[PDB]
Amino acid sequence: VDPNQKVIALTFSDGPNPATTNQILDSLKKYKGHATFFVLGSRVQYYPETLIRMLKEGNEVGNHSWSHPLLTRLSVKEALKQINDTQDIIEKISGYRPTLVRPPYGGINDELRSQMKMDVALWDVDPEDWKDRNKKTIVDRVMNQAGDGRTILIHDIYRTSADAADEIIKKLTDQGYQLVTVSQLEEVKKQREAKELRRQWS
Ligand SMILES: [Zn+2]
Numbered sequence: 001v002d003p004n005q006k007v008i009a010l011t012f013s014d015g016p017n018p019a020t021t022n023q024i025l026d027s028l029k030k031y032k033g034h035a036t037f038f039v040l041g042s043r044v045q046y047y048p049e050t051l052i053r054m055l056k057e058g059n060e061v062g063n064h065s066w067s068h069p070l071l072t073r074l075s076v077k078e079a080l081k082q083i084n085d086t087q088d089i090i091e092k093i094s095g096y097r098p099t100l101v102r103p104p105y106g107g108i109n110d111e112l113r114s115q116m117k118m119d120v121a122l123w124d125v126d127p128e129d130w131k132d133r134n135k136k137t138i139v140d141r142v143m144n145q146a147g148d149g150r151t152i153l154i155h156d157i158y159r160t161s162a163d164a165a166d167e168i169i170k171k172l173t174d175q176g177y178q179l180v181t182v183s184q185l186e187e188v189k190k191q192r193e194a195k196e197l198r199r200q201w202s
Helices: 020-029 042-047 048-056 076-094 110-117 135-145 159-174 182-200
Strands: 009-011 036-039 060-063 150-153
Touching: 009 135, 009 159, 009 182, 020 159, 036 042, 042 048, 042 076, 048 076, 048 182, 060 076, 060 110, 060 182, 076 110, 150 159, 150 182
Parallel strands: 009 036, 009 150, 036 060
Antiparallel strands: none
């Protein structure tokens, strides 16, 4: 990944769902891009093959809880169980340990932050594809807001979202963006910031 060229992080919450997730994985593979999938533990348990596929194809996997409660409605113990049960199923299937967590609905507090011991990964651009389940509406909202360094949220459980994601992936690729994982974007930002180190010997 070249930090001097455009980067963007496409991210997908709520899968795996083979019919839609596999289509998105196909699009990413066709256009030579990667993404980050924030998965539900319950769905990993239903669809272990899709977890393996997304990892095999170079995508990053994050934790999106077991069954999608608002974690701030739970006790800390119950919320940690949602997260840890999801770590556990991912580990049991794949041997992979996610480092990124995306709390359902963005809901988090300082106590959960400190106790989860994971990197909280939210987003910058949200076309609300759960609300406007319409391919062109989703595409246009994303493409109008896309820019270097941004993180896009799509929910990979709807047909219109998978169809929109294919078009978004194509258009961003045509525009010269590198489609990177969340962790790769973090690294790019650090590489760009590190240019300031050169001031020490200028
Ligand atoms: Zn979700």
